[PDB]
Amino acid sequence: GSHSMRYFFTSVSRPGRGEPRFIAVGYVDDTQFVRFDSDAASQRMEPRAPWIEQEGPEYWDGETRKVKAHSQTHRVDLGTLRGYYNQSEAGSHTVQRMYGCDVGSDWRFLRGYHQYAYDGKDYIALKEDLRSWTAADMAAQTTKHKWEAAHVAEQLRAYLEGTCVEWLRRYLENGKETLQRTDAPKTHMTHHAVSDHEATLRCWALSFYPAEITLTWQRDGEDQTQDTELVETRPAGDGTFQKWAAVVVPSGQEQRYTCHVQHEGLPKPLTLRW
Amino acid sequence: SLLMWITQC
């Protein structure tokens, strides 16, 4: 299927108790591979997935060096942003950034991203054409104005459109055994009498990878979409994920319902019945 | 691999 490399950055200011905190994490598909933490004693980019460890020191020194340059830029963005919204220095604020790329089933380039947020809300983002920006509010008009002045987008193009995907393909083939992997969901079902005139049916999918999955309940073949409780796909802690979907049905009518499980590692869509 | 040049907002 598709693949992608993402880099997430978080910076939080601390009113008056040290520098702001910086946290950077890198992913390939649904697998974290690097991380940096201002408060960790390392002060270096750390490996977080088995492949990648084959990368030489020059690589580590580099990413470590680059990611600190990222922390400075953000250290500053925190101050400039207050200024744009003319905010006090008293309360902490948060700055987030997420850039990366996507590749098709054939590893060919598809999309590029470079988004930014302040206090959990969009601030500015690169349009799909990788040439123009979208400013959420008047403060971002300023960031946008100086970005098109400093030909930022033109400079990113190079990265997203190339460097980013080159590295992705690289990590994709060095990590075959982990990344190219597909784990079908260990599946099963639950039944607990909810109310006095009905019983909940919960369809389980466990230890699967990648996280992309589709759990679908049906009644008499027609999928009863509304009335289906879905939990947010959550990690198992071991590199795989778990998820469920449930429906509360009038007791006795349980034979009529059906759960359907779609997943890449699955050769043909499952359908379960109580 | 991270991006090398990042512009201040």
Epitope: G62, Q72, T73, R75, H151, V152, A158 | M4, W5, T7
Partner: T-cell receptor, first 112, second 113 residues
Framework: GVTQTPKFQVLKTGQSMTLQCAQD?????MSWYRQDPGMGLRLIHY???????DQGEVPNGYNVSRSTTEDFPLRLLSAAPSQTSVYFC????????????FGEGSRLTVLE | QQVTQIPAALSVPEGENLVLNCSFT??????LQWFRQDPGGKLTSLLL?????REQTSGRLNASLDKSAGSSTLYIAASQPGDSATYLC?????????????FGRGTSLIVHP
């Protein structure tokens, strides 16, 4: 801009000297060079952020620190005649244009 | 990787438009910047061309960037004796993670009155 002090200085071998450098352009990158008479810039140290520093081409006899964004002081622990030279502090954003901004320069002369 | 500037020396009479060459081995660069330095004096930035751009201008100075063929040229209109100095072009890498620039040894310009 980038302001260096002092511009001229004379030292006897063995003295510890600190060349200051500061900028108010919020540049993340600051660097130190020494250029001997018509030789070419030779990188001593550079830093991309508060708290970090990295060696260059000739870091010997030179220590450096980056406690803040604005200041990047270069210190010669123990002065030597070989260090008699013209020092240049230079800064830039670590993005944007990536334009270098050189300081005025500092002439040191170490005499025994 | 390697920045070359030849002719290494250049002598002309004032009034003549001139050219200063600059060549680099690694095209993967974020920018190219022209400086000016006079014996005893400092370095003065002249122009700054981003890797995405070409013809940048300032006063009688004008310069192109052909990053594909690792080349840059500095132009100077009506040469003034005050132009006499050493001109340098330096570059900075598109990646590699050090932001450390690379200078050429510059060309010696003497504009005779």
């Amino acid at each position: 801009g980038v302001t260096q002090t002092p511009k001229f200085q004379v030292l006897k071998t063995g003295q510890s000297m600190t060349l200051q450098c500061a900028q108010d352009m919020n540049h993340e990158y600051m660097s130190w060079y020494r250029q001997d008479p018509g030789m070419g810039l030779r990188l001593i140290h550079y830093s991309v952020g508060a708290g970090i520093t990295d060696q260059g081409e000739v870091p010997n006899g030179y220590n450096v620190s980056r406690s803040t964004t604005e200041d990047f002081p270069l210190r010669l622990l123990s002065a030597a005649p070989s260090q008699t030279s013209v020092y240049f502090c230079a800064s830039s954003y670590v993005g944007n244009t990536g334009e270098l901004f050189f300081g005025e320069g500092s002439r040191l002369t170490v005499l025994e | 990787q390697q920045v070359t500037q030849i002719p290494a020396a250049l002598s002309v009479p004032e009034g003549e438009n001139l050219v200063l060459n600059c060549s680099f081995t690694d095209s993967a660069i974020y920018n190219l910047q022209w400086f000016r330095q006079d014996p005893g004096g400092k370095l003065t930035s002249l122009l700054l061309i981003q890797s995405s751009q070409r013809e940048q201008t300032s006063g009688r100075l004008n310069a192109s960037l052909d990053k594909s063929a690792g080349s840059s040229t500095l132009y100077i209109a009506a040469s003034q004796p005050g132009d006499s100095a050493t001109y340098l072009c330096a570059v900075r890498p598109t990646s590699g993670g050090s932001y450390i620039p690379t200078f050429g040894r510059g060309t010696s310009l003497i504009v005779h009155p």
